[PDB]
Amino acid sequence: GSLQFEDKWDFMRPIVLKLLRQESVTKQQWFDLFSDVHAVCLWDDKGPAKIHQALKEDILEFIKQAQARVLSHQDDTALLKAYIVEWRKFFTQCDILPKPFCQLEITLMNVEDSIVRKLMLDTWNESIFSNIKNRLQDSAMKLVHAERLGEAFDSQLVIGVRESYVNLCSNPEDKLQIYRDNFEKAYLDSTERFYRTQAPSYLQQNGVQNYMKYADAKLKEEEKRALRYLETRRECNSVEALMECCVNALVTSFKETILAECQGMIKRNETEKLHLMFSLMDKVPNGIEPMLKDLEEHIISAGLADMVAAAETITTDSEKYREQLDTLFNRFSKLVKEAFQDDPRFLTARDKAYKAVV
Template sequence: MRPIVLKLLKQEAVTQIEWQDLFGAVHSVCLWDERGPYKLRDALQQDITMYIKQAQARVLAQREDQALLKAYIAEWGKFFTQCNYLPTPFRQLENSINNISKVAISNTSNALKKNNNNNIEDSLVRKLMLDSWNQSIFVDIKQRLQDSAMKLVQAERNGESFDSQLVIGVRESYGAWARGSERVTVSLPLELEDYIPEVEEFYKKKHSGRKLQWYHHMSNGTITFANSVGRFDLDVTTFQMAVLFAWNQRPLDRVTYENLRLATELPDPELRRTLWSLVAFPKLKRQLLCYQPVVQNPKDFAENTAFWVNQDFALIKNGKPQRRGKLNLIGRLQLSTERSQIEDNHSIVQLRILRTQEAIIKILKMRKRITNTALQSELIEILKNMFLPSKKMIKEQLEWLIEHKYMRRDDEDINTFIYMA
């Protein structure tokens, strides 16, 4: 079985008899060995990983930017093509694993699941291939790919010619393996949120009929941290950014775990993992965040665990604090895409809505009459110690309060609100 799989991965010629033998072998292993489906899946993953490591070596052998991108796109193109072919002989494997894991579900549900497996997009083997590509090659050379692609974009801005397919190819490889990933809820900093409509509008103009998907758990950026010691550029994930920006309006405050969960809307596993990367980063002698009480594991964070920004943070070199520097906090932080409990996330959203409504009514009771701009400023001031409401949420709650007769718009100025007792 293994030689045929390796031939398929390498896009080598496979005879009709070999193709049929692969179907038969998979079918036999899955039906006659109780542990067969899992053994087969593990062996398949080993073969896929081994092939990807060989592809990675071929890509990294390239030193020049354009050659690196060409090599990556060529390897990715071959691999992605096989993502549509290799799952076909392994449908029995997918059916067997699904039936084992869903043994308590009715026959009707199992039948529906089997039908879904015929869809290559939902294939377990296809997802295994794309995830393995991401974990085994993409994570290791992601920064080199981004740097090389951005150099070409910069060259274009300077009037130099370049092959645009190199940048497009890298971008498409991002999107392909991302499609199988589950998106994770996060409340973006207002500084980022304000740009999203502009980006979406630009995308619509360039790509008619397409929809832009945001995968925040796969993105990162650079922020500047300034304190009395100096200024430092920090490469962070979007999740780390969301956590750190919770202190923008209250730099000296101590914020509890529960309030950070409310401010970021991150699922519990992601928030714990992200906070741990900021309080116990192995390369740092002075951590970016401090916390109390001290624990040995992120799972031990309690709702009342307090976190605060380390105002003495600095990069240490030769035993001396540096006034400037750059630090990559992303490192090997594994960002899982575990789905949080739907009820848990729903409760956070509902709590935010209630807090926003309460704050709006409190402001209107005091002011009786207020402009939209002034209302938003006061609202953010009241809520900043818990979370920063998005513009969308503020607008929705204003409309809800108007609809339920708690307030109304001024007849002569729609941007002025009047409290209704």
């Protein structure tokens, strides 16, 4: 009474699939499945070298089934839900299926680092992930592209896709290696592409001081949207890699147009508007250097004629020849409070320009 892998596989292979498909399994089938592997990985010569390849082939055949069931929907929404159902089941089988092969994994040589699970998590990456990866993102982004426009959706669809890019990376050195190059990369491109044809239009439609209330409000809405769809669990600077994309796409890409209005806001004393510009050009590298320069030159030329009317009139009354500059300085020492809250960079130019009136 003997037995080989050829005689016993046809009794095992059902139990593999029942576990791969997350189908219910009986207690006796668990023990039969250990007891078959105990028998093949011993009495069979190339037995362990056959459960190894048979199990590659059968895992791969299931993951090809799952890909067809996901790609069965044409609704870019029910297709996201279908991918996560099959994966969440899958990921949850990676903790179960590698157990009846405890002797295989020894005969071929605990916890996560097993050969079977590594075979399961890989084959999902070799196959269904690698093939659907670009569709997975060209669908999830449309649900946020739509979220930016009114369409309320199930925000767990793009979250579930996110935390599925986190769990499939088996790299211990870079855990976010297939999230930082796939999910994060598409969310930056779509956010970028979105504000190249939606934000240049708010500048054609409405004015500039209107666009500043817009770029502002869109850095606030793209941030609380990133603190949902992006990674916050383990620190990665992804949400902040988005705001750099956004600043560049909202504020940096229109700095000259914003800084052109600087000079007149000073003259007309528009402090609520200079504070808004400040809020925007302060997220830009060296963005307020022209701003500083517009308050440094205006202070000068103002205190360059609002002082010439003295040598032709008040020259012997320093009690008046010094007070105009007690008020002049006050015109600018109070613009900075109301507008820049006495930021130390604008005091340096408030002073760099007032030394020239001396």
